[PDB]
Amino acid sequence: SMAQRMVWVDLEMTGLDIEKDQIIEMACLITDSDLNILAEGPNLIIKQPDELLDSMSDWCKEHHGKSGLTKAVKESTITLQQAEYEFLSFVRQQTPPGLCPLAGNSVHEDKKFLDKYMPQFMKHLHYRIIDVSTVKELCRRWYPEEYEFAPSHRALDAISESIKELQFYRNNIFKKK
Amino acid sequence: MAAGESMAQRMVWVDLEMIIEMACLITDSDLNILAEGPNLIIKTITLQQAEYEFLSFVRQQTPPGLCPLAGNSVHEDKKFLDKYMPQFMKHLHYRIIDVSTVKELCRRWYPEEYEFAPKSHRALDAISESIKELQFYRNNIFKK
Ligand SMILES: [Mg+2]
Ligand SMILES: [Mg+2]
């Protein structure tokens, strides 16, 4: 039951460089094994210095500017430690320790950034992941017709769409019972 | 399909076992093995030479940036390779085909079929087992 819950997480960062870039937005949801959303967790924008934001890549600067994320990061007073406190408290109240997997689209990158910057949060979770993008690639290869009809760079919207994408895959390309 | 799409839908299967043994091969979109790559030992050669070997192989086998890494819990292997074989990883897509994801989905949604699924320490045998496991999943829990 609770051991089969999933911890869905999406991150927005200043870039892909794990050695230099930081987390600027994070959202978390808790679903059961049937993808029913059980709990909506914190949706936080994490304060980061102005120099890193002004030094972002062209893709990151353009997109995080058009979405208003850069201005929100400039506006935020939430540190990385406070964000980890909130997320750790949420998952500790929602999941049993060490049994539930991270979930999302290409969530291995999010797992890299969380292992580096939120290690206690990741210590609460299982080591396996549920990568929706794996199912996406398998659907693109084996079910192109269904893939064509499958369903803002902000964390909450992205993770909601990830859950819906996996639900579409289960409804359309997995064996009916 | 259009010319080149079947090649763009190939998979680069890799496995690493800890002295580190590393093996790699290529499958088509239907999991048929097309070519076997190097099977190397790194700390009988150096990391840079082994990276060159694997990169030359995947250059001969997949178009740049289009094909994903594949394997069981391949995210850990990708974490290692992004740091120690970055030129090899730059040839690959950023998405992965994690057989462990399908394994978890089968355990949750198809437990009866899950009890029948396939489950040495050499990397090539691990790749073979991962391919057979994904094929079992396609045969038994995916839409006919
Ligand atoms: Mg995402
Ligand atoms: Mg996003």
**Amino acid identity for residue B125 in this structure:** D
DSSP letter for each residue of A73-114: HHH----HHHHHHHHHHHHHHHS-TTT--EEETTHHHHHHHH
Chains A and B form CB pairs within 8 A to the count of 75
DSSP letter for each residue of B68-80: -EEETTHHHHHHH
> Tell me, what DSSP letter sits at residue A167?
H
Closest CA to A104 of B10, B113, B98, B87: B98
The partner residue sitting opposite A175, judged by closest CB among B79, B102, B142, is: B142
A17 interfacial to chain B (CB closer than 8 Å) = no
For residue A87, give the CATH number of its domain: 3.30.420.10
Residue pair B97/A137 in contact (Cβ under 8 Å)? The answer is yes
A-chain residue closest to B67, CA distance: A137
A31-35 long-range CB contacts below 8 Å, 24 or more apart? A31/A5, A31/A6, A31/A103, A31/A163, A32/A1, A32/A4, A32/A5, A32/A6, A33/A4, A33/A5, A33/A6, A33/B108, A33/B109, A34/B108, A34/B109, A35/A6, A35/A163, A35/A166, A35/A167, A35/A170
Q: In B, residues 43-62, which contact A (CB 8 Å cutoff)?
A: none
- Separation of alpha carbons B116 and B136, rounded Å: 9
**Overall number of domains in chain A:** 1
- Separation of alpha carbons A109 and A115, rounded Å: 10
Query: What domain range includes position A88?
Result: 2-173
What is the experimental resolution, given in Å to one decimal place?
A: 2.0
- Separation of alpha carbons A117 and A114, rounded Å: 5
A58 Cα: distance to centroid of ligand 2 (angstroms): 16
Q: How was this structure determined?
A: X-ray
